[model samples]
Target: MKNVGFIGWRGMVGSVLMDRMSQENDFENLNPVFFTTSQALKSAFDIEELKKLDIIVTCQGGDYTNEVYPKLKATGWDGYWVDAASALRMKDDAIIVLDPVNQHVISEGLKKGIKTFVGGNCTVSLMLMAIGGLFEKDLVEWISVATYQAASGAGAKNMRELLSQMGLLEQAVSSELKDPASSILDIERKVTAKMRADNFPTDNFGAALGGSLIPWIDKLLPETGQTKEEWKGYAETNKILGLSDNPIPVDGLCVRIGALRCHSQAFTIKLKKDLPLEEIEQIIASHNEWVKVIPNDKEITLRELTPAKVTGTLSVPVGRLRKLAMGPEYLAAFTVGDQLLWGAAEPVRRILKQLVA
Candidate 1:
C-alpha cells in the first residue's frame, strides 16, 4: 500500500473529502497519515517524513501549500501532490482535476508524469459537471452565466456569520410576527433595521450576506472589472478542457448568496448551431450519471432545480432549458450542486482513487 499523507483534513472541504473517502472504504487501500499544519508540536514541516510518502493531499488553504510545497519539491521527493487550493492550479506543472469533464486530460498528463493535480474552481467544476456535454460536442460558442454561490464557498467562518445574521434578523421580528394581523411592512422594516445594526455579524463577509448578497467574490475588480471568482470561470475551465489558448469565452458574474452550502447558476449559452431542446437535454444528461435534467415546466423546475433540493446530495440537477428569444442559437439553462461536494472535495478524492487504483 502507498503511504498517503493528508493535511487540512479537519477543515470543511477536507472533512467532505474524508467523509467521501470513508464512505468508499478508500482508506483500506492506502496508508493514510494526518499531517498537522501551522505551529503544531508534531513534525508538521518535516520534509524527511513527507519524503517517504508516495502521495500527499492538502485542503489546508493556499498559505500552507505556498510555503511547504516548494520545500518538498526542493528535496527531490517525487510524490504526487493533490491539492484543493487555487495556488498551484495555474502552474505549468499542475493539471486541474475534474474527472467527469476531463478524465482524458488527466490520463494524458498522468502518462506524461504530471504529478500535481489541483481541484478546479467551485463554480467551474459544478458548471462543467452540468453542461460539459455541450462543450464536448463543440456546440458552445460562448456562455454568460450568473452564479448564486453559497456561504460555505467563502469558508467556515462565513457560514457562521451568515447564520448569525439570519438568527438576528429572525429574532428582531419574531415578536412582531406573533400576531397574524401585524403589518407585513413593519416586520420587514424591523428585520432590515436589525440587518443594518452596528452589532450585525459581518466579520468574514465584510458586508451583509444574510438577507442581501455580495456581487464580487474576491479582489481583481476595478482594473479588470471582473472578480477573482469570475476570472476562474474561463481560466480554469479552458485549462481543464485543454483549450487554454483558444478559450470559449465563459464570462459571468459570480455572486455570493445566503444559502448555506449549495451553489446555483443561470446560463445564457450561445450555441454554434440551432439544436432541438430534446436533443440538448439528451446530450447533457448522457454525459454524467449524477447530472439529472429537469424539465422546463414551472412546477417541476421550481421543485427540483434549487439549492434546497440539491444541497448535501451528489446530484447535479439542471433545468430551465429553453430557447431564448434572441435567436434560435441562444439557450437558457440553470443548475445547482453542493459547493463542497463535486465542487471542492469529490474531485480531489476521485483523483486519489484514480491514482492508487
Candidate 2:
C-alpha cells in the first residue's frame, strides 16, 4: 500500500478525483491525506513530510505548482509527483501522462529515473480518447479540429458565472413574455445589448459566456496567432503520442460554450490511405475501452450527441462518421466526453494505479 497525499481536494478537478477514487475504491490499499489552502498556508506539508509519501497528486492551479513544487524538488524528494496544471508540462524532465495514449512513455521515463508527471490539456486528452488508435497505427496524417469546450474547463468560478448569466437570460425572456405587448425581437435586442455592455462580470472569462461562443479559449500567442488552448492541442498531442521525428500536423480552434460539463469536438482527419467506411468504423470502435462508436441507426439528430446528453459518463461517444466529399482519404466525425473524467481526473487515477503496479 502506497501512501498518497492529495492537494486541492475540494476544488473542481480535485472533487472529481475524490469521487472517482471512492467509486472505484482506488485507495483500498493506500494511505490517503488531504490538504486544504489553509493547511498549505500553515506549512502543513514540509519537505520531510512530502518525502515520506509514495505519491502526491495535485489538482491545484499553476500558482500553487509554481510556488510549492520547486521548494519540494530542492529537497531532493524522490516520490512520484502528478500535476494537473500546465506549469511543468513543457519541461524536459517531466512527462505528460495519459496512460491510454502513452503508458509506454511513462514506463520508459520510470526506467530513466523520471518521477514527475503532468496531465495533458483536457481538449487534447479528450481528442485522443476518441481517436488515439489511428495515430498509434500511423494512419492519421493530419487533423483539423474545432472544439466546443464546456465552461467548466475554465474552472468552478466560470461555470457559476455562466449559469448565472444563463438564468438572467432566461428571466429576461420570461419577463418579456409576461407582458404580452413586448415584442420577441425587442427582448432579444435588449439581452444582446446587455451582454455586450462593459458592466458584464469578467470574473474568469473576459466576456459573456451564456448563449454565446467565445472563439478564444486561452491567452493568444503573439507569434502564432493561436490561443494557448489551441496551441496546446498541437504541441501536447504530439508529446502524448510520443512523436518526435515527424510530428503530426494538427490545427485546432478551441471555443468556449455555455456548457456545464463534457466537451464536444468536430474533427476532419486526413488518412494515410483510403480505407473503407466500415473499416474506419471498426478502427475507431476497437480503439479503447472508453470509446463508444454510435451507429447510424441509433442516431438521433446532431443535437442528440450534445454535452447535455453525454455529461457524467466515462465513455467518449463518437458519431457522424462519414467520408468527406473532397476525397475518400478524408473523413469527418464528432465526439463528446466528460471532460472531468477522461480529460482530467481519470488519467491521474490511472497513473497512480500504474505506479502501484
Candidate 3:
C-alpha cells in the first residue's frame, strides 16, 4: 500500500474527496495522512514526513502547488504527484487525467514513465464527459458552447455569499411574498433594489451572482479576450485527447449562474459527417459508464437533466440532444455534472487508485 499525503484536506474539494473516498472504502487499501498549510513542524510543513510519502494528492490551490511542488522535488521526493490544480496542467512532461475518457493516453504516459497527473478544469472536464464520445471516434470538427456554472465552482465561500445574497433578496419583500395576491411588480422592485444596495454581498464574487449571472469566469484575458477557463477548453481537451499537434477548436463563453454544485453546458457541435440520432446517443452512452443520454423529450429532460436532479451523484446526464437547424451535420446537447464530484475530486482520486494499484 502506498503512503498517501493529502494536502488541503479541509477545503471544499478536499472534503468531497474525503467523503467519496470513505463511501468507496478506499482507506482500507492505502495509508492516508492529512495535511494543513500553516504549521511549524507538522502536517504539510514537515519535509521529512512528506519525503516518507509514496504519493501526494493535493486539492490545494495553484499558489500552494507552485511553492511546494518544486521544493519537494528539489529535496528528491520522486513519488507520484496527483493534483487537483492547474499549475502543472499544461506542462509537456505532465498529463491531464480523465482515465474514463483518456485511459489509453494515461496508459501510454504510464508506460513512458509520467510521474505527474493533473486533473482538468471543471467545465472542460464536464464538457468532455458529456460529448467526449464524438471526439473519440474522430468525428468532431469543432465545438462551441455557453456554460451555466454554479457558485461552488468559485469556492465554498462563494456558495455562502450566493445564499446570503439570495436570502437578502427574499427578505426584502418577505411580507409581500407570503400573500398569493401580492403584486409581482412590487416584489420585483424590492428585489432589484436589494441587489443594487450598497451592503450587498459582492465581496467574494466581485459582482452580484445570487439573482443574476456573470457573463465571464476566471481571468478574462485581454491578450486573447478569453477567460482562463475559456482558454482551457481549447488547450486541455486536445491535450487529454493526445491531439494537441492537430487541435480541435473549442471556444465558448463561460457564465456563472446561481446554482449550488453542478455545472451545466449547452453546446453546438459540428460533426464531420451526418449520423443518426440513435447512433449518436449510443456512441455517447458507450464512451463511459457514468455518462448517459436522456431522451430529448421535455418531461424526461426536465426530470433527469437539471442540476437539481444530478447533484451528489456520479451521474453525468446529457439531454436535449438533436440536430440543429444549421445543418444535418450540426448537433446540439446540454449536459450537467457535479463540478464538486466529477469535476474535481473524482478524477484525482481515480488517478490515485490507479497509481496505488
Candidate 4:
C-alpha cells in the first residue's frame, strides 16, 4: 500500500492511467493526490514529502513544473517517478519500455534509480512489441509505413476543433434544406484535404486535425524538411532502446485521420537477413503469441496485423505473412493497437510494477 501523488492528472493520458488502474484493481494500496500546478499550494503539503512516496506520477511537461519548482530533485525522496509526459521522455536514464518485449529495459532503468519511465509512441509500442522475439533474432533495416494517427496525440483542443467543424457542417447541410429563401451567407464548412494543406492556419499540427486527413502531420523543419512528429519516431526508438550512433532508421509517412482512439500503421519491412519463409512461421509462433501468421494453401507467408484485436491484449496479432515478390528477405505486414495503451500507458505500467516491487 504505497502512497502516490500525481500532477496534471486530468488530461487524456492521465485519465486513462487512472481508469485502467481502477478497472484492473491495480495499486489498491496506493494513495493518489492530483494537482495542476506545483506552486501556490501549501508548503507543508511538502512536494518533498511526495518524493518519499513509493512513486510520484505526472502527466505534465517539464516546461511547467521542471523549471518553476524543480520539485523532483527537491523532494529528496528516493522513490520512482512515473512521468507520462514528453518532459522527460528522451532522458538517457528513464526506462522507456514496450512491456511484452522491452521488459529488461525496465530492470536496467530501475538499477540506475530511474523509477521514471517515458517514450511509448503508438507506432513503436504497438508495432515493435507486436513483433517481439522477431527482433531478438534479426534486426529490421528499413520500413515503408503509412500511419493513421488519432487526435489524442494532439490533445483535447484538437478534438474540440474536429467537433466544432462537424457541428458547422451538419448545420450547413440542415440549413440548406429550409433555405430556399434564406440569404447566401457562406458559412465555414468541415475541413478538407485542400484546406488542411493550404488554407487552415498552421499551429500545433499544421491544419486543424478534426474531420480531415492532413497528409502532412506537421510543418516541415526548414533545414531537414522533416516534421517534428516524424522525427519523434527516429529519436524515440533509438533512445528507448539505448542505441548510440547506430540509431535505428525508421522512415515513416504519418497521416492525421479523424479517428479518436488509435494510431495504426500499415508496414513493410526489409530485414537485414534473408530468412527462410519456413523459419518465419516457427519463429513468430514461438516468440510472440500476440502475432497471428496467415498461411496460404501452398507456402506464402503474408500476414495482417490489426489494432482492434490487439487493443486490450498485450499480444500483437499479425496476419497475412508472406514473402515479398522482391525476395524472401522482406516481410509485408499490418499491425494495429490502442495507441493509448500499448503505445503509452502500458509500457510505463511495466516499469512501475518493477519499481514498486
Which candidate leads the pack in lDDT?
1
TM-score of each: 0.98, 0.93, 0.98, 0.78
- The predicted structure with the larger lDDT, 1 or 3, is 1
Model 1, range 133-188, lDDT digits (tens) per residue?
Answer: 99999899999989999999999899999999999999998887888999999899
Look at candidate 2 and give me any clashing residue pairs: none
Pick by TM-score: 1 or 2, better one: 1
lDDT of 2 by residue, 168-286 (tens): 77665787878989888999987887777676665678788997988988788998999988998878889887786578988879988888888999999999999989988878878
Q: What is the lDDT of candidate 1?
A: 0.92
lDDT of 3 at 34: 78
Name the 10 consecutive residues with the lowest summed lDDT in model 4: 297-306
Clashes of each: 0, 0, 0, 15
lDDT of 2: 0.84
Q: Where is model 2 more than 4 Å wrong at Cα?
A: 39-45, 178-182, 197-200, 297-304
What are the Cα lDDT values of the candidates?
0.92, 0.84, 0.91, 0.63
Q: lDDT by residue for model 3 over 10-38, one digit each (tens)?
A: 89999999999999999889988878877
For candidate 1, the TM-score is 0.98
lDDT per residue as tens, model 4, 173-264: 56654777644453233223334344344455555555558877755877667776677677776666666478767777788887666677
Give the distance in Å from residue 95's predicted Cα in candidate 1 to where it truly belongs: 0.3
